[PDB]
């Protein structure tokens, strides 16, 4: 089957994606890593930005990019920080 | 057992003066990180800071981490501005009050470093040649 | 070139970190670090009612010499300012104020602390405290 | 036979001496150390404060306390510093 994942893009990622948010359908068990590969498949600028991003699942830091996505959830895309 | 007087991200201009007043100990050290008119060899016109929704909490967590590990420090306050900023505006302000100056200097310095490392905010610079850059993208 | 010395003051008038920070910050440099040394209401387990600072006539010149040395060492420091108050002071009053503007924060923090260090070491000024029990003390005498 | 020296007391020294300044006749060739001895004979409190004092001759730091006083001079009495 499939699962519906909401993706929220931030900063450079949102600029490169051309959108702020996006709902995606992916095979159940798809890893965050695979998801990321998919997000940049048709957008070289986004793909490049994603190379340096970190990720949240329901605003919790993703420690394991191999973590399977089995339930609907929100993935936040976070470029390298640049405060101060 | 240092107090965290105030911690906030805000669009409103932030005052080092106000924050040094907040932490008022015998020694006060304040820091202001200010928007420069250049980035390397390029002239800067203006910038914007944007923040993740978790930014506020993260800044609270950092401040508490620094406060807990410190010694001889009485009061800490720190703020990061978000939104459009002009050259000369303070983007980051922190103040530390301690019983002695050494603890104030050393704690304020480490506090600023950890905030810069861990605060989920982003910087969008705009240059005089009409180009722009997302810093560290 | 050496860093600007925007303020170097021995004054009886009240001093403010606030004005000093604004003055060094005009360079629009990357980082500003300020120090305020304020009078505590207690010292060595004794409650302080008030104190006075006195200065040797050469104090002003000594402060200027210190400022020149600090301003010379070039770590991307753009502006410095330092002031010490003399005469009668009340609890909470700033006794010593310094500010440093630099390209980056490392030089600002390190230079501001070093400036305060050298000033305290070499400035010919003396502190006279008055305690609640009616006794008084010339610090370090 | 003698030389006239002006002594200026500061802070704790002035407090212990009860005066800010005095003028003094001392034997020509008297060392600064010998002068300090004679100054301290005033009272034990001043004598006590003088132990930790430094000295200027015409506002030039005294490095050698054996320095002879052979010309009319101003000697400043400086307690340990305490400022900041």
Q: Which two tokens stand for residue C78?
A: 């753009």
Which chains does D contact via 3+ CB–CB distances below 8 A?
C
In total, how many domains does chain D have?
1
How far is it, in rounded angstroms, from Cα C82 to Cα C117? 12
What sign has the CA pseudo-torsion C56, C57, C58, C60? positive
The candidate with the shortest Cα–Cα distance to D22, out of D13, D32, D31, is D13
CA distance B119 to B107: 17
The packing angle between helices C105-122 and B101-118, to 10°, is 180
**From CA C125, how far away is CA C96, in angstroms rounded?**
11
The CA distance from A7 to D54, in Å, is: 73
Interface test with C, best of B26, B35, B39, B110 (most C CBs within 10 A): B26
What domain range is C14 assigned to? 1-141
For D29, half-sphere exposure in the C-beta direction (CA atoms, 13 angstrom radius) is 1
Handedness of CA D35, D41, D42, D43 (dihedral sign): positive
Alpha-carbon gap, residue A84 to B31, rounded angstroms: 11
Experimental determination technique: X-ray
What CATH number is associated with residue C71?
3.90.1170.40
* Nearest beta carbon to residue B32 from set C32, C35, C92: C32
CA distance B129 to chain A (A): 20
CA distance B113 to A59: 23
The answer to whether the Cβ–Cβ distance between C56 and D84 falls below 8 Å is no
Q: Into how many domains does chain B fold?
A: 1
Stated resolution in angstroms: 2.1
The residue segments making up the domain with residue D82 are 1-84
3-state helix, strand, coil in chain A (%, to 5): 25, 35, 40
DSSP C75-88: SSEEEEEEEEE-EE
Return the beta strands (E) in C1-141 as ranges: 4-11, 31-38, 42-43, 46-55, 77-85, 87-89, 94-102, 125-131, 136-138
Residue A45: closest C-alpha in chain B: B137
* C140 shares contact with chain D (CB less than 8 Å): yes
CB contacts of D82 in chain C (<8 Å) are: 125-127, 138-141
Give CA separation, B57 vs A10, A79, A84, B79, B119, in Å: 18, 19, 17, 12, 9
Lookup: tokens for A63:
């420690």
């Amino acid at each position: 089957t499939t699962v519906r994942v909401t993706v929220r893009y931030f900063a450079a990622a949102a600029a490169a994606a051309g959108i702020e948010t996006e709902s995606l359908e992916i095979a159940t068990g798809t890893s965050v890593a695979e998801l990321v590969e998919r997000l940049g498949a048709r957008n070289p600028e986004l793909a490049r930005v994603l190379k340096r991003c970190s990720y949240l699942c329901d605003e919790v830091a993703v420690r394991d990019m191999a973590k399977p996505l089995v339930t609907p959830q929100t993935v936040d895309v976070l470029p390298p920080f640049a405060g101060g | 057992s240092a107090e965290i007087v105030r911690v906030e991200l805000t669009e409103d201009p932030i005052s080092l003066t106000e924050y040094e007043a907040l932490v008022a100990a015998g020694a006060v050290v304040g820091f202001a990180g200010v928007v420069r008119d250049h980035d390397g060899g390029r002239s800067v016109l203006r910038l914007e800071y944007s923040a993740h929704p978790t930014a506020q909490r993260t800044l609270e967590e950092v401040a508490e981490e620094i406060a807990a590990q410190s010694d001889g420090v009485r009061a800490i306050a720190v703020s990061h501005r978000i939104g459009p900023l002009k050259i000369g505006d303070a983007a980051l302000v922190a103040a530390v009050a301690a019983d002695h100056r050494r603890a104030a200097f050393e704690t304020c310095a480490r506090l600023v470093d950890v905030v810069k490392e861990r605060l989920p905010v982003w910087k969008h610079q705009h240059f005089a040649d009409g180009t722009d850059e997302w810093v560290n993208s």
